[PDB]
A paper describes a structure:
Based on this observation and careful analysis of secondary structure predictions, a construct truncating the protein at His100 (mouse S100A7 tailless [mS100A7ΔC]) was prepared and used for subsequent crystallization trials. Crystallization trials performed on mS100A7ΔC yielded diffracting crystals in the presence of Ca2+, and the structure could be refined to 1.69 Å resolution. The crystal was orthorhombic, in space group P212121, and contained one homodimer per asymmetric unit. The structure of mS100A7 revealed the canonical S100 protein dimeric architecture; each protomer is organized into two EF-hands with the hydrophobic core integrated across the dimer interface. Like all Ca2+-loaded full-length S100 proteins, mS100A7 occupies an open conformation with HIII shifted out from the core exposing a hydrophobic cleft. The Ca2+ ion is coordinated in a canonical pentagonal bipyramidal geometry by the backbone carbonyl oxygen atoms of Ala21, Glu24, Asp26, and Thr29, plus the critical, highly conserved bidentate carboxylate of Glu34 and a structural water molecule stabilized by an H-bond to Thr29 Oγ1. The Ca2+ ion is coordinated by side chain oxygen atoms of Asp66, Asn68, and Asp70, plus the backbone carbonyl oxygen of Gln72, the critical, highly conserved bidentate Glu77, and a water molecule stabilized by a bifurcated H-bond with Asp70 Oδ and Cys74 SH. The two symmetrically disposed canonical Zn2+ binding sites at the dimer interface, composed of the side chains of His18 and Glu28 from one chain and His 90 and His94 from the other, are all visible in the structure. Nevertheless, the overall geometry of these sites is set up for tetrahedral coordination, and in fact, a Na+ ion is found in both sites. The most significant difference between the two protein structures is due to mS100A7 having a standard N-terminal S100-specific Ca2+-binding loop (Ala21-Glu34), whereas this loop in hS100A7 is truncated to 12 residues (Tyr19-Ser30).
S100 proteins are a subfamily of EF-hand calcium-binding proteins found primarily in vertebrate animals. S100 proteins are comprised of two EF-hand helix-loop-helix Ca2+-binding motifs. They are distinguished from other EF-hand proteins by a unique, noncanonical S100-specific Ca2+ binding loop in the N-terminal EF-hand, an intrinsic dimeric architecture, and the binding of Zn2+ and other transition metals at the dimer interface. S100A7 functions in the protection of the skin and mucous membranes and is a biomarker in inflammatory skin disease. The binding of Zn2+ has been shown to be a central factor in the antimicrobial activity of S100A7; sequestration of Zn2+ by S100A7 starves invading pathogens of this essential metal, a mechanism termed nutritional immunity.
Numbering used by the authors:
A (entry chain B): 3 to 95
B (entry chain A): 2 to 99
Write the structure that this text describes.
Amino acid sequence: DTPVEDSLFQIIHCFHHYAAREGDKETLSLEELKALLLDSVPRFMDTLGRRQPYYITELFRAADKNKDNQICFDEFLYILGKLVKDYHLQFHR
Amino acid sequence: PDTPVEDSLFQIIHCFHHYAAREGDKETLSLEELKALLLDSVPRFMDTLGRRQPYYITELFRAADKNKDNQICFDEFLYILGKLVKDYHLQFHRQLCA
Ligand SMILES: [Ca+2]
Ligand SMILES: [Ca+2]
Ligand SMILES: [Ca+2]
Ligand SMILES: [Ca+2]
Ligand code: NA
Ligand code: NA
């Protein structure tokens, strides 16, 4: 695999690792998303301070397009887009 | 150090920037830059059926180029990254099944 292929599989592995903990094994609850972010993107999460929990709930509701209170793989793309853009702003600054 | 996922995000960003720097705007992809990015970076994706054919790469570029300026900026590239991650998600499932 190329380094980018290794990167895509790492992201997919990540999603499944957290989604499998509770409820539907293919979807993230808010708590599964919270664990995924705190463990996987700490540089980003560390920057948010007091309003971290407010940010995670806003991100989750924005991603949960069908309002069923869980993130499927397709809805997770929304979160990946936000993470990629945040790390992009870091890649520069 | 950075987590595996953080390393993954930086790899994706680095890849975009490497190809976008070749010609024209150094922060956007020409069709020729996108084509090289895909064939070099995601060969398993490009191996699928007809994705190596001009038709597929030209239609993916057209779909991604939302403002019709004949280049893919970083925000438009997220469209392509979503398509790639969804295809590699099927490959992840086929590998688990084998
Ligand atoms: Ca779950
Ligand atoms: Ca949902
Ligand atoms: Ca360019
Ligand atoms: Ca464009
Ligand atoms: Na899956
Ligand atoms: Na950039």
